[PDB]
Amino acid sequence: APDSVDYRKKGYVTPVKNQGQCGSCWAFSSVGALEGQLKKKTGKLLNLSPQNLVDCVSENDGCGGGYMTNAFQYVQKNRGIDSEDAYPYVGQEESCMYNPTGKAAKCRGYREIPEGNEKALKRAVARVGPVSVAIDASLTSFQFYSKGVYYDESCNSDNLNHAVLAVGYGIQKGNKHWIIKNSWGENWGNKGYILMARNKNNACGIANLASFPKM
Ligand SMILES: [Ca+2]
């Protein structure tokens, strides 16, 4: 795998979004991994719909939280997911309003990275494209992150509670990192991104619940 990769450079990542007060980070992480594959498979970059997932993944809990593997299973079983324009984000749970006419992507299933394997996570981002990841984002240092390579020893790999997307990895000033896209708006972190330490004992549990969709 290459020493570093940055999908933002390849045009594989859509602009950073803002989930608002809904616990829909899982839907944004899932659509980001799907938009990454959609760009690789069609050459077009376009926003997928987080709202479609929030109201349609009955296996999940709306604004009450959920998992990306559950979202990829819904897209596969449903034979599609709508584009954000066809199904706009409103930030609150509503009845399922999926419309096949607005279908913008399909999924044929998914794959999860070996648990805690930072090496296998690296091989996947490099081989597949952006990958959905779960992290413990409960620390004040994470919430107020601004720059550099994030690392807080108090982060708990066993307390996963937020979903984000790995769009690459590299090194900055000698510190290996994962390039993470959040869905807290462009004003959060560095233009809505955070570089998280890579190979530092799976900091924040970044390789514990990683997955990507098959397309
Ligand atoms: Ca499931």
Side-chain angles (χ1 to χ4, degrees):
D3 281 344
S4 76
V5 301
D6 193 326
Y7 286 103
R8 294 170 301 183
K9 266 158 170 174
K10 292 175 220 183
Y12 278 43
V13 184
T14 65
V16 165
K17 316 291 204 295
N18 203 320
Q19 60 181 86
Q21 300 311 101
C22 178
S24 51
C25 58
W26 63 264
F28 282 91
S29 177
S30 296
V31 304
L34 281 159
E35 315 159 316
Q37 298 298 290
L38 176 70
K39 165 76 193 191
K40 184 171 184 178
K41 308 308 180 193
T42 74
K44 278 145 179 180
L45 173 69
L46 65 78
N47 316 300
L48 291 186
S49 156
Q51 209 50 71
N52 192 152
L53 304 180
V54 171
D55 324 316
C56 309
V57 187
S58 53
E59 227 218 312
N60 278 337
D61 187 60
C63 283
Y67 293 109
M68 301 84 84
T69 56
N70 286 2
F72 300 139
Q73 297 166 303
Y74 158 72
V75 179
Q76 158 175 59
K77 182 190 162 176
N78 189 74
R79 295 180 166 94
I81 179 177
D82 293 322
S83 62
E84 154 76 39
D85 297 326
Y87 205 156
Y89 191 60
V90 290
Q92 81 173 87
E93 157 128 83
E94 307 229 274
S95 284
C96 172
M97 278 167 300
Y98 172 86
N99 199 308
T101 312
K103 163 156 58 150
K106 331 189 276 195
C107 166
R108 36 211 299 129
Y110 69 100
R111 265 167 179 171
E112 298 167 85
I113 278 61
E115 160 184 53
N117 206 311
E118 281 203 87
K119 181 169 185 169
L121 180 50
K122 171 183 171 170
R123 266 181 261 130
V125 166
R127 155 189 95 252
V128 186
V131 168
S132 297
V133 296
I135 47 162
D136 156 32
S138 77
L139 301 171
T140 296
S141 54
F142 177 86
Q143 164 168 76
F144 287 84
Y145 164 86
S146 75
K147 46 74 132 72
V149 172
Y150 184 72
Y151 184 75
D152 194 306
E153 209 164 273
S154 68
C155 210
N156 201 313
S157 51
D158 270 285
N159 177 54
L160 299 181
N161 47 62
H162 185 51
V164 291
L165 176 83
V167 294
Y169 56 82
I171 183 165
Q172 186 176 89
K173 267 37 166 185
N175 315 292
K176 296 190 173 184
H177 60 70
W178 288 113
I179 305 172
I180 299 290
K181 187 194 194 197
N182 207 340
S183 52
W184 284 356
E186 153 150 65
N187 211 45
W188 178 92
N190 189 322
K191 317 194 209 64
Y193 285 86
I194 170 154
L195 292 175
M196 301 185 70
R198 184 163 59 91
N199 290 350
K200 285 203 63 171
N201 197 48
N202 180 45
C204 290
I206 192 141
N208 276 343
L209 201 59
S211 68
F212 60 86
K214 291 186 190 298
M215 186 182 295

